[PDB]
Amino acid sequence: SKLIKHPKIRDAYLAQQTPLAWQQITGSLRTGGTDGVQAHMNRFYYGGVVFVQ
Amino acid sequence: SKLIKHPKIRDAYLAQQTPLAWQQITGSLRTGGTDGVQAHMNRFYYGGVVFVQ
Amino acid sequence: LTNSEKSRFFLADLTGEVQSIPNTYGYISGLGLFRSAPQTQTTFLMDLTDWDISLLDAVDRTSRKAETSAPERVRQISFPMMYFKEVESITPDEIQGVRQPGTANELTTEAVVRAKKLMKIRTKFDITREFLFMQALKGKVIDANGVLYADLYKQFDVTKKTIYFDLDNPNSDIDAHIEDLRMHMEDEAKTGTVINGEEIHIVVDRTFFSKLIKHPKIRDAYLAQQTPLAWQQITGSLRTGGTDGVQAHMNRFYYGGVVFVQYNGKFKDKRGKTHTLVSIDGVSDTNVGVGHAFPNVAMLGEANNIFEVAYAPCPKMGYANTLGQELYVFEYEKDRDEGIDFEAHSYMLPYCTRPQLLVDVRSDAE
Amino acid sequence: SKLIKHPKIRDAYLAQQTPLAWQQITGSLRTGGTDGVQAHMNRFYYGGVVFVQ
Amino acid sequence: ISLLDAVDRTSRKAETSAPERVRQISFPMMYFKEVESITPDEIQGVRQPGTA
Amino acid sequence: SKLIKHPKIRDAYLAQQTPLAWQQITGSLRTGGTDGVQAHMNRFYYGGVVFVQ
Amino acid sequence: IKAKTYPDFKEFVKDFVANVKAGKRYDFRKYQEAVLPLTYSSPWPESDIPEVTDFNYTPDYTVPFSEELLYSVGAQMRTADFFMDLQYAIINGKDVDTVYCEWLARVKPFSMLNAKLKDS
């Protein structure tokens, strides 16, 4: 939560007109299946690395 | 009414150039859905969820 | 695969062995800047000629009949070179009764000892070549023991230029510093030809690269841009390409016709002092970025390489007045069957003929 | 150098999106010309006129 | 590994290199044990939930 | 001069991604002419009309 | 500062420094996009900017560039950072004489806003 809403990433993506306009949509893009609880796990792409909740 | 004009959602949709953003910023929000009185039922997409009035 | 433990009468398990190998950097050596110039003598000479004087014709009166003239200058210089004598020997005492690491009851052999020893000698000999190439790029060829062998900005009567970027202050004009860096290498080449000035290499470290990409002007210039390059440099990896030998991809940045490349090479001497490749002598301060800029092969042409390395022979029979080689490896057997002796020689020295084209960039202000 | 970074010009060119004139902001200004010693001379386009250094 | 210092050509002097290091370690492991029992007292006269 | 520099007109034409807006804001405002002395007279497009100097 | 009470940026910043000189402080760098309208001729602010109480802002540079300039002419910085630096100049003793917004085109994340400062 503290990372996805940081001002350095937020404006960087509300300025990039690329299909990663999942800034308006959902982070639950994951291949969740933290099987057992939720179908899709939170996933954030930035700087070539991926943060998984 | 309070949700659709919230500054965060409205300014997130205004900054992106997608036909959906144009549809639910300047266009008609009626979209689809019958009511028995209304011919089209108010709808709004922000995240992975949809709001129906 | 099973051996003792803290008693000789019980058995434990030996899964295997884990090894750690020191990092080796080879970016500058792989750049191919320095071209080989094998020699047959221990020293060589050069001629330095400079007309360097055109001046403006002052007007005079037709009836007076008066006028001007112009002189000429020619000089000469010389060059010594460096020598290295890596030696090492093997004996039967390294095979008798010593078990191989990672195994239970298998004795080591002579072949593996010789192979690893020779490999260590070769890599130890290549890392010094890389260090000397970097030192020559810095403009001063200094031995790892701090012994000066070629002060190229005195042998050549020029002065090194340092460009202060001042990346801490947002009000600093990065475009002005880049333009100054580009213009100096055009106005100071004095090769008599036309200079592009934007083909230069730029090699920086962590501090300079981070402070450069952090700048508000640089970030703003790309944030409001819908080019895929802007998307990659603001959001994407920024580790585009390259290989310094330790990391799969070196990080590069584009802000026009120049490219900032972050190289972080470190070496140690016998005394344990770390010889970082991208550094400026004297300024042993953190939080200050240091970078080096130098021309590439395409700037001045291949009809004027500035960088080259001279190799000379070794003081052995049959190796007099012959072309030099990168490495001379000799093998000798001890008398009465007591082991094997090795040797490794190299008579080498890299140098740059226009050291004024080697400039430094700093993240601090003047 | 003073003309390049003037607010009336730099801001207008930064706001000007998809013009192929990102070169004047991000790219090199050495876009043509040559004196005796320099391969490409600085030049800038604004207001229908060209400023050459 | 270490860098090489330059040496005089006609003195014939040189630098050797030093040898490697070998060590050893060990590892213990955990043990997990769980027990269970079944008694007729859990079956006699007990209604299966969801049925009458 | 007063018309082309009005905050309404300039702010409206700045938030545009059309070639016309790019020409009017950062470009030659001298399309069309021969006023006798001028090779190209000033003209400005705002609505369905044009203003010629 | 209630939403859309000033019809343009020129009259918005004339009262923004008035409140700051009066002891009121603002900080909206985390929700900047939700309070800044688009185009400087739009009513300001887009949404009401709340007063902060914990205003502690120590910049990493000299906020007063010269004795009569907040930034060097042509310096680009985050729009929210402009207001934090403008407040810093007023706190330290510099009075605002004019805010440069006449020919600017962008208001959101990065803008070339500058101010002329004065003594006392």
Helices and strands in order:
This is part of a larger assembly, with six copies of chain A and one copy of chain G (120 residues).
Chain A: H1 7-13, E1 43-46, E2 49-52
Chain G: H1 9-21, E1 77-78, H2 79-92, E2 95-100, E3 110-111, E4 114-118
Antiparallel strand pairs in G: 1-3, 2-4
Topology, number of strands of chain G: 4
The profile of the biggest β sheet of chain A is:
2 strands, antiparallel
- Terminal Cα separation of chain A, in Å? 9 Å
Order of strands, widest sheet of chain A? 1-2
The quaternary organization reads as part of a larger assembly
Order of helices and strands of chain A: HEE
Description:
The PDB classes it as virus. The structure is cut from a larger assembly and holds six copies of chain A and one copy of chain G (120 residues). Chain A is built from one helix and two strands. Chain A has 53 residues and is of the alpha+beta class. Chain A has a two-stranded antiparallel sheet. In chain A, strand 1 and strand 2 form a beta hairpin. Chain A is elongated. With 120 residues, chain G is of the alpha+beta class. Helices cover 22% and strands 12% of the residues of chain G. Chain G has helices at 9-21, 79-92, and strands at residues 77-78, 95-100, 110-111, 114-118. In chain G, strands 1-3 form a two-stranded antiparallel ribbon. The longest helix of chain G has 14 residues, at 79-92. Chain C binds chain G through residues 168-171, 173, 216-217, 219-220, 223-224, and chain G through 60-62, 65, 71-72, 74-78, 106, 109-110.
